[model samples]
Target: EDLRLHLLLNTSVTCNDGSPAGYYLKESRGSRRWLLFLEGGWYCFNRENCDSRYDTMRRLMSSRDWPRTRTGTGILSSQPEENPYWWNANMVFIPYCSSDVWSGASSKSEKNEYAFMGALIIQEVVRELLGRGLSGAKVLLLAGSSAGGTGVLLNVDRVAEQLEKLGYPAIQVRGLADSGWFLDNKQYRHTDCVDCAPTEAIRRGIRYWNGVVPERCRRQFQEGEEWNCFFGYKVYPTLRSPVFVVQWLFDEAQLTVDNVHLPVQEGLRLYIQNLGRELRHTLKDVPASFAPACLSHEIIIRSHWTDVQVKGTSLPRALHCWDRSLHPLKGCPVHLVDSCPWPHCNPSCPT
Candidate 1:
């Protein structure tokens, strides 16, 4: 049901690291509905990491250099029958090049000489999409995977507010943060720098990307502990827009990259259990969510989208339940599904 045309829109937004940046727009069936996905490849902080990112440009920061296999993956599927809810929707892929979770505003880094204007990139891309036809979009889905998912978590309100201000106040804006609801910094252990613990990554990332932490988030923290405000769990509770968080309790990336694994198996279970408890509390007011009990990462683009289930509920059921609530029919009560259980929280996943 899609038009099957990948039109690349060159925008005024520049990737901070001097790489060319733009969005791929694939027009869909006869409708104003849209799905905008922000491609994710994580981020680079500090001089060493940023330089390594530039060296590995194609994989991390360059839109032109993305793998050929990226086009038809995940939510970008061109087949309607595969993704019933979204394959027919206007697909827009915003390539990730800003390397700052797409939330940074600062451009000047003393040690890392590169641009960090992801916030501006989002603004410019949205403006371009609006001019092209998104201005008339009836229902829009803003989603991101991994770090891009984190960006969606951080910028959903801004995107919603912008749409309202641009004369689409009645537009239905839904957000999905796939593997982007990063937990608090407690489960990690650090031996390198005393201050550079996994929990402290957000603080370092804020400074690295020259990111702007919301003032309201800052207010949530204690007088001297304002640094904790940038984490997603801290930000989600304050959001006015509805968002669905999709993640795994024993997230592979979090376990390996952040060194979250403990000595004892029971201790590991306790750690992930605490994470679920925190996540459930953080997303208490959210419309819908799905936290599978596996050890995988990044769901929307994987086979697990259809294979993974919880108590007879798959991803489609979760989204259907959420969307139905968005516009209830006749006399049907809102059947929104919240968090999943932590019973099989650590199933064996691929290494």
Candidate 2:
């Protein structure tokens, strides 16, 4: 039999700014493996940052959609596949980054915050039940997309600690981040470019993120109007679970990174590679099938006048390059290609 456990997560404490931030649990009748899913960039909004539409979009997608909750329980049953983390006790949580953190910190701190949120979410869930804190949640498998993917790289140690606290095996869970922007070096130097985008999205993004960190953190990040969220000190302490990274070549929203004067793409890739080395894992990469046109990625793409699904499930299943599956397996595929320093488009494909 399968069991569903509803968990309430205090989004405020964890810095995950989704509409409703909390942990969800589903118990399987088998090995009892638990799955944890987190969304980055999405959780930066909450009751505090709700005024901004930009922040709103971020929080909406980073949410623990109840619809998905109902659907997820049946995915494995329908597939009839004996997956790695598919035991009855699987769980999924959407903990998004506080835009408040991403907007005005140093690149390093922005990165560190990602890990901070990861630890916070895991612990919040544990505390909800185990009555402990960020040091106690045990996750069996973790999946995420975009900024959510970055969270995995930011805080593996916290995850390990939580697992240990739970008294499970030294290694508790695995991770898979799709098109996750794990590291950002180029660093948004100025808020102008982001702010000038016609919509208050960028400006409010900064406001929301700045609202969270300490003044010292603000100084460490923003120099005048140059917003920098630094995360250089982050490093993986220990990891036993394997990780898979998926990606698409031409993700539209990522183009925002290109607009700024900073060049953070390589910096992020280097960090992932370093993490792979530390973990003794080879690490994997995948590509996006169509233009990385996830409607979710590009809010504008969704013309109020029209209807679409943003490349549908083409979002790379994270296993092979293009999963081509009608519905992505539990997680949104990363679908990233090798266009780091400067995202190169498929000159070969009909642009």
Candidate 3:
């Protein structure tokens, strides 16, 4: 870990026009490599709105409380002494989610689909940094979790290209994504919950907890711009950099269901079952399908599946249990629908 820059070294930039251009950054003087992080939907503006978040990031880094600082809740109430750490004192980036975005359970487009955009914005910040003085030749990254998680899975392809355009090496544009809140549009689960268990639970998990706070870097994601353009959707993977993704199936901080070891309690249902696996699989052949379809104009994937332009087949009832969509569905595929069936139902359920 490059322990040179302070955690609260919330970077900022002032142009000749002297505008408060979002959150600025501080590049390591000697080291050329950089790790750019995007925060989730948090980051209060002033001390009144946000807690002393940034300050604590630096203090904890200096005190070697990274793991705790990045994992625990620091302060909730204004009980200064109870959660003392000088947060806003080092405000880096503060992003807020618009109301219409996460209105409630009814919101069709989940937050995760839009997370990659958060990381995109941070890259823009870094690009600006390079313009000022930070060398584009050095390795720079874009990464995050929850909605931020998509930043890792979805943005790499494009991120690598962006850095490359700035003269930076593709392999240098690495990413770090933690248990993200990614979800697809397809409906699988019957439940639709918003501002419920997932939301509250995620909030509790990431809040400062006696030094176990998250990286002050991820806060840049909360800059709150609704980057639906860059994040969430299936875009072409133009980025050439290698990305490291951190996915926690049982991650309580995500406010999600239908995931590994974190199944729904009720007989709830929704789209996007096993989101992680699906995303990973899609990534494998994404190049072939990343393109804009002229006829399917709705949401075209600028892809290269020319050989298979793409196609499909049929199957029988017995074989319909298992979805060929996971791989390539054959006409007579086996019916391994639920290896772990419904709760206490039969052999499918996990005992």
Candidate 4:
């Protein structure tokens, strides 16, 4: 069966436009597993950026037009053929409308003209789910893509902590973050690079949205450098829950920030190579990861997600390996990375 849409009514938690936040749910009849997938969208740092995005991509910042139903895809798919490992698990899809990258704690005010309550929304959704039988779940896999993927890194530990405080300490919380591993490297051309914008944007966003990060990661940085926690490499070390990262070595979004175009120019070739090397270095110590040398962006939700492979192992296969590794008795190699030097070197990459 497909997922059904439901809205949160009579709650202070809302989207950027003050509309009630909502999620899609697909409950399994006799299952103890749960998967809460956070939907992804780009974020806005300042009022000008938020105002501009409201004009262009309002749906991402407002849930006024959300449909009554949504069909699950890829990992969210309930079909045994599409999602072999998680098909029988109860699934929940939370929409992104806060434009805060799921990290904000502030609410709407006259000066800001919008709410930045992404962090609070997640908590509210979990509280509601507790009433809907999520309290009995044996395991909860918190997964997301892009900004939502980043959200998993920022909030997974918090969710686990919340469950404990709410008297559900036994529920095992794991994270699956896809295409959210972003690097803070300089752009290809100039010292004053365009890629630096993300860093600055995040710096400004922390203040503008009152963003909340993991407490352990927060202490590692100075008062002003809390923005560093937004990067996966910086915060991964502080995470308590077991997280499986899925990232593209040549991520298109990261490439766009670096201003590196396709058809691989001479100067940009070295840049791509460096990105792949840095990505591998950053993930070297991670216990579970699937980093492919592809020029694509998000894939976990794509129909052809199973086609992309690293070290001859598909993402599904790697995830299954990670799942087994969690149990002490069975364990295998879950860290799959493409060793090929350049992008598109993997034959399994989607065209």
The superposed Cα distance between candidate 4 and the true structure at residue 289, in angstroms, equals 0.3
- Each candidate's clash count: 1, 43, 61, 0
Candidate 3 — which residues are off by over 4 angstroms? 1-21, 42-120, 131-133, 152-154, 168-171, 181-191, 195-239, 253-351
lDDT of 2 at 82: 31
lDDT of 3 by residue, 308-351 (tens): 11113111121122212322444533211112222222221111
Q: What RMSD value applies to candidate 2?
A: 11.5
Candidate 1 vs 2: which has more TM-score: 1
Ranking by TM-score: 4, 1, 2, 3
lDDT of 4 by residue, 245-272 (tens): 9998899888877767676577677778
Backbone-clash count (model 1) = 1
Candidate 4 CA-lDDT value: 0.87
Instruction: Itemize residue pairs with steric clashes in candidate 1.
Output: 185-199
Report lDDT (Cα) of residue 141, candidate 3: 45
Candidate with better lDDT, 1 vs 2: 1
Could you give candidate 1's per-residue lDDT for residues 1-351 as a string of tens digits? 222322235534557555556766777557788888877776766767777778857445555555433355556676755675566677877778788888777654466577777777776678778877887888888888888888887777788888778788977887888887766555445464322554566567777777765556667774545446546677877777778787676566666655664335776667666765666565555547776666665568654456566555567667767777777444332223325445354233223
Scored by lDDT, the top model is: 4
Candidate that would win on TM-score: 4
Candidate 1's C-alpha runs over 4 A off are 1-12, 64-70, 108-112, 192-195, 218-227, 261-266, 272-285, 328-351
Better of 2 and 3 by TM-score: 2
* Displacement of the residue 213 alpha carbon in candidate 3, Å: 30
